[PDB]
Amino acid sequence: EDIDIKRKEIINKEGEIRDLISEIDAKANAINHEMRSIQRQAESKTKSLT
Amino acid sequence: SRLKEIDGRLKSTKNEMRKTNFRMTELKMNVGKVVDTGILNSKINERK
Amino acid sequence: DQMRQELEQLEKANEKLREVNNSLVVSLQDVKNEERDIQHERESELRTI
Amino acid sequence: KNDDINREAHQLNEIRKKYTMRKSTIETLREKLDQLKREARKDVSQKIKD
């Protein structure tokens, strides 16, 4: 039962790791979108906005 | 229809995630009982 | 003890599955840009009408 | 990492259980030699009386 509870704990930890890496991938997509938008903004940042 | 297709794909990916969770659980239940107690070699020592 | 080989094979299969679904979930925010664009177009058309 | 350390602790307990099975081997070997001496006692006495 000790082995069993340790294995259930590490399975919960693996699930939490999967959730964390999915959130990390979502944040990477968000940072890529923010980088391309700020690149467009730096390209368009001129007088009369164009 | 495009957003319907993408939410269907999201449901399919969720089903694949559940399948991978089931695979992890069965791999755990398989490797958990490898060298636990089946090392009874007294009979084969007597035999040898 | 012998099935540990098929077990590590299934672990590699789970690795390939997680990598393909990670490459799939990063293909779900590209349509967010186009849906935001079309919703902005609809907002502009309601402002026009 | 805690999973790894408790797993190696469980492995050390398993090789500690290797002394338990080693203790039972000399225990069942005692029964084996006792049965051998019992079956030989009924044989040498049988040959003597024969």
Q: Which residues of D6-45 are buried (b: 16+ CB within 10 A; e: fewer)?
A: eeeeeeeeeeeeeeeeeeebeeeeeeeeeeeeeeeeeeee
| Helix B2-31, helix C4-25: angle, nearest 10 | 160
Q: CB D21 to CB B40 under 8 A? A: yes
Q: CB D3 to CB A9 under 8 A? A: yes
Distance from CA of A18 to the nearest CA of B (A): 10
Q: Can you list the alpha helix ranges (DSSP code H) found in D1-50?
A: 2-49
Chains near C with 3+ CB pairs less than 8 A apart are A, B
CA distance C42 to B47: 85
CA distance C17 to B24: 12
Q: CB B23 to CB C28 under 8 A? A: no
Contact A9, C5 (CB under 8 A): no
**B35 DSSP assignment:** S
The angstrom resolution of this structure is: 6.9
Contact residues on chain C for A18, CB-CB shorter than 8 A: 18
Contact residues on chain A for D9, CB-CB shorter than 8 A: none
Q: CB A13 to CB D10 under 8 A? A: no
How far does CA A21 lie from the centroid of its chain?
Answer: 7
**B48 DSSP assignment:** -
Structure tokens of B8? 């269907």
Phi and psi at residue C3, in whole multiples of 5°? -75, -10
The experimental method behind these coordinates is cryo-EM
CA distance B10 to A40: 30
3-state secondary structure of A45: coil
Q: Which residues of C20-48 are buried (b: 16+ CB within 10 A; e: fewer)?
A: ebeeebeeeeeeeeeeeeeeeeeeeeeee
Beta-sheet strands, E only, within chain B: none
